[PDB]
């Protein structure tokens, strides 16, 4: 045989195994491919990889600035480096070198006659919410990660527990915490507004046993079934009303006024209320069945997350539940997608990922006890944790 024939055969077999399974099996296969790559690389390969994989975010940012990915995604035929350069207003040599690099990391695809077509990654980077995620990685995460090593060295490697005293303050030369500082930056606010439009899949309703959790709960008089606290575009409310259209009870999306305004266009005309509410203030809706917090508490250290829960707890009755939908990394063998997040949010927000036991300790500080845990993603675990009053 030959190295090329062996490589093609590996690809053929891995592709057959991947299609055959579901999305969780494909995620497990991808994690295995990454681990194999790390185990088989040479020392020089390790250093080269660490040196050069960072180029991907910068070059994706350049392609986004140029509008290259959306343009290539709508192109019917392969495009030369000339055509793309002239159309997008880029230097021809610069464009050619960028495209060669992008093709080498599958950001685009290069044809046999050295022309260019969209890849899966091209299409992904053309989607506004995902492009906004990439831009957030470049303009928000990279600086904090840049500042983290010298920040830890200066401070003799402390345990970071405060949002106002972490790498972010050094990275952006400010006293403010990340959220307060971002509120003053219009372009970053706009990018976050676009990033909110991305909807994760799957969601908690794929495994959440709603009827069982409800039991004999009654919606009268005018009680709320579901209060989506910091619900963003209200994707959770939309999916809930879609899956259980005949279930009685108010479905309430709570967020800040600008986000609710952004959400108005894609919300259904009836069945979901938009209610301006700051979750650092007491919860107005009394005795709701579910108070839902998805990807909220992960962004706050224990003190602030506890304060958010303490703003909710006095509104609960015996049947009320607080549903924390968030990451629940394992005690051991956590994956890169749950630990890298931990490092990023430590550096930018002073917060952390929490194991199930850590979630239970935090919630017990608020007077809550865990009743059930409903995983809905694998192998990186996201779960809806249902808490009741102690």
Region of 200 (left: φ > 0; alpha: ψ -120 to 50; beta: rest) is beta
With binding defined as CB under 6 A, does residue 236 bind ligand SAM? yes
Q: Minimal distance in Å, beta carbon 101 to a copy of itself?
A: 4
Q: Minimal distance in Å, beta carbon 378 to a copy of itself?
A: 8
CB 118 within 8 A of CB 109: yes
Q: How far is CA 176 from CA 171, 181, 348, in A?
A: 12, 6, 11
Q: Single out the residue of 168, 204, 279, 387 in contact with ligand SAM (rule: CB under 6 A).
A: 279
Q: Minimal distance in Å, beta carbon 27 to ligand SAM?
A: 19
With binding defined as CB under 6 A, does residue 255 bind ligand SAM? yes
Q: If 0-12 CB within 10 Å is exposed, 13-18 middle and 19+ buried, where does residue 98 land?
A: buried
- Sites for ligand SAM among residues 161-220 (CB under 6 A): 196
* 226 three-class SS: strand
With binding defined as CB under 6 A, does residue 259 bind ligand SAM? yes
Looking at beta carbons only, is 137 or 295 nearer to ligand SAM?
295
**Span of 52-60, 209-217, 254-262, 339-347 interacting with ligand SAM by CB under 6 A:** 254-262
Q: Which of 363, 383, 378, 372 is nearest to 333 (CA)?
A: 378
Q: Minimal distance in Å, beta carbon 363 to a copy of itself?
A: 20
With binding defined as CB under 8 A, does residue 205 bind a copy of itself? no
Q: Single out the residue of 235, 289, 298, 352 in contact with a copy of itself (rule: CB under 8 A).
A: 352
- CA 311 remoteness from chain centre: 25
Return the sign of the alpha-carbon dihedral for residues 177, 179, 184, 186: positive
- Say how far apart CA 116 and CA 339 lie, in whole Å: 35
With binding defined as CB under 8 A, does residue 190 bind a copy of itself? no
- Say how far apart CA 313 and CA 286 lie, in whole Å: 10
Q: Minimal distance in Å, beta carbon 294 to ligand SAM?
A: 4
With binding defined as CB under 8 A, does residue 270 bind a copy of itself? no
190 binds, among a copy of itself, ligand SAM, none (CB under 5 to 8 A by kind): none
The residues that bridge with 293 in the sheet, in sequence order, are 324
Residue ranges that bind ligand SAM, judged by CB under 6 A: 196, 230-232, 235-236, 255-256, 259, 278-280, 294-296
């Amino acid at each position: 045989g030959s190295h090329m024939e062996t490589v093609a055969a590996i690809k053929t077999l891995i592709q057959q195994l991947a299609q055959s399974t579901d999305q969780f099996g494909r995620a497990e296969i991808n994690d295995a491919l990454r681990e194999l790559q790390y185990s088989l690389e040479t020392p020089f390969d390790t250093v080269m990889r660490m040196s050069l994989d960072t180029c991907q975010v910068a070059v994706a940012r350049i392609g986004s600035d140029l509008g290259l990915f959306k343009h290539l995604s709508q192109c019917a035929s392969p495009q030369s480096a000339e055509e793309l350069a002239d159309h997008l207003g880029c230097g021809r040599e610069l464009m050619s070198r960028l495209l060669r690099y992008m093709a080498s990391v599958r950001m685009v695809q290069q044809t046999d006659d050295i022309k260019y077509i969209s890849s899966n990654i091209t299409q992904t980077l053309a989607v506004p919410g995902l492009e906004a995620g990439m831009r957030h990685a470049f303009e928000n995460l990279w600086p904090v990660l840049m500042a983290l090593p010298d920040f830890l060295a200066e401070r003799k490697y402390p345990d970071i527990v405060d949002a106002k005293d972490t790498a972010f303050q050094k990275a952006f030369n400010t006293d403010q915490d990340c959220f307060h500082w971002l509120a003053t930056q219009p372009t970053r606010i706009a990018n976050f507004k676009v990033l909110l439009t991305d909807e994760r899949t799957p969601n908690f309703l794929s495994t959440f046993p709603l009827e069982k959790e409800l039991g004999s709960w009654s919606a009268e008089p005018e009680k709320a079934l579901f209060v989506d606290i910091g619900g963003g575009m209200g994707h959770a409310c939309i999916r809930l009303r879609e899956k259980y259209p005949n279930q009685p009870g108010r479905v309430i999306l709570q967020d800040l006024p600008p986000v609710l305004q952004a959400a108005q266009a894609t919300l259904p005309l009836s069945g979901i209320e938009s209610m301006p509410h700051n979750f650092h203030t007491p919860q107005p809706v009394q005795g709701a069945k579910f108070y839902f917090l998805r990807l909220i508490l992960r962004d706050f250290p224990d003190h602030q997350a506890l304060e958010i829960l303490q703003n909710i707890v006095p509104a609960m009755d015996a049947e009320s539940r607080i549903v924390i939908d968030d990451g629940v990394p394992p005690e051991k063998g956590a994956r890169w997608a749950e630990t890298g997040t931990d490092i990023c949010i430590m550096s930018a927000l002073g917060s952390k990922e929490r194991t199930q036991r850590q979630w239970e300790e935090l919630a017990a500080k608020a007077g809550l006890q865990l009743q059930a845990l409903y995983q809905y993603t694998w192998p990186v675990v996201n779960a809806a944790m249902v808490f009741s009053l102690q």
